[PDB]
Every structure is written in C-alpha cells, then in structure tokens.
Amino acid sequence: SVEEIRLPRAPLGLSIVGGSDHHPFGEPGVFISKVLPSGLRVGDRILAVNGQDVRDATHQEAVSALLRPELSLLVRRD
Amino acid sequence: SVEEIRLPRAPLGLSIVGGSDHHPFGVEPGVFISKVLPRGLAARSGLRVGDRILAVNGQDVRDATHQEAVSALLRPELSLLVRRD
Amino acid sequence: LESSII
C-alpha cells in the first residue's frame, strides 16, 4: 500500500539506497535501508517528500530532498 | 590534513555517504560528508562536504560499513577526526 | 550506494 507518513523533526536517523542514476529491496526507486532502532519501515519505497516527487530522482536528489532545513513522506511498501 | 571536529549529538543538517560495503568523494571504502545545510549544526561545528570521517569518539571508521559509521555518530559532544583536502 | 540523513 501507499502511506503518507508524518515525522516530527525533533525520528532521528534515516538511511536510503537506490535512485535512478544507479540492494535487496524492490526497482529504480529510492528505498529506506534503515531507521534508528516512527511509522517508517525498512524497504519502504520513498515516492514523495513534502509533496515533491522523487519516484525517478537520483540518489543525491533523494538525499537533498530528505535533507531539509515536520517532514512528510509518501511511501509504498511491499 | 587531519582535523578534530566537535559535533553535537543528533537534527544536525548533514548527510554522509560511503563505507567499506562501497558518489564523487575520494576515488575507496571511506565514509564522507556528502552534504551540509548551510546554517545547520554540522556546518557550524566545522564539518565540510567531502570530509572523510576517520574516527568517532575513538571508534576507527576508516574501514567501517556505512551503518557502522552511522551508529557511531548516533550513540547517545562527539569528537570526530576527519581527513580533508 | 547508501546515504544517511541526520
């Protein structure tokens, strides 16, 4: 399914792999590889960030979108 | 050169990339600072994009996996040694 | 290629 996940910024650490310029997840997508040991799950595909499409973004484009000065993530899992 | 950077505990406004499990930095197992927000905490602490993180509170991360390096940085000020330039 | 945002 596809879920909108809201995360308050102050929840600690997010790791991602993938991207279009290119692991066991998925795809051309960007995928959550880790979350500090809420709502998000490893393997989640990240579709949008704060309403901005990242479905086809490069890895560095995804990173820059995650690295924002609340964070909203649209994700697909499974 | 090799610099000692004091970095607050994690947000910090930085991304890191790399590790021994394998970007434009180095070239190469290292963990590097790939982006810092201009007024974020990492920037103010003196970290720089392109910095290769060598150690974190005594933990040698020169040959660490990406997630080893991160865990180190997220253990609950950090003393970082970085190689740069 | 893996990045982390903190």
Residue numbers in the entry:
A (entry chain B): 11 to 20, 23 to 34, 37 to 40, 43 to 53, 60 to 91, 94 to 102
B (entry chain A): 11 to 20, 23 to 34, 37 to 41, 43 to 91, 94 to 102
C (entry chain C): 53 to 58
Give verbatim excerpts from the published study on this entry.
The Scribble (Scrib) protein is a conserved cell polarity regulator with anti-tumorigenic properties. Scribble is an important regulator of cell polarity and acts as a scaffolding protein to mediate a diverse set of cellular signalling pathways via its four PDZ domains. The zoonotic Tick-born encephalitis virus TBEV encodes for the NS5 protein, which has been shown to interact with Scribble in a PDZ domain dependent manner. In summary, we show that TBEV NS5 C-terminal PBM binds SCRIB PDZ3 in order to interact with Scribble.
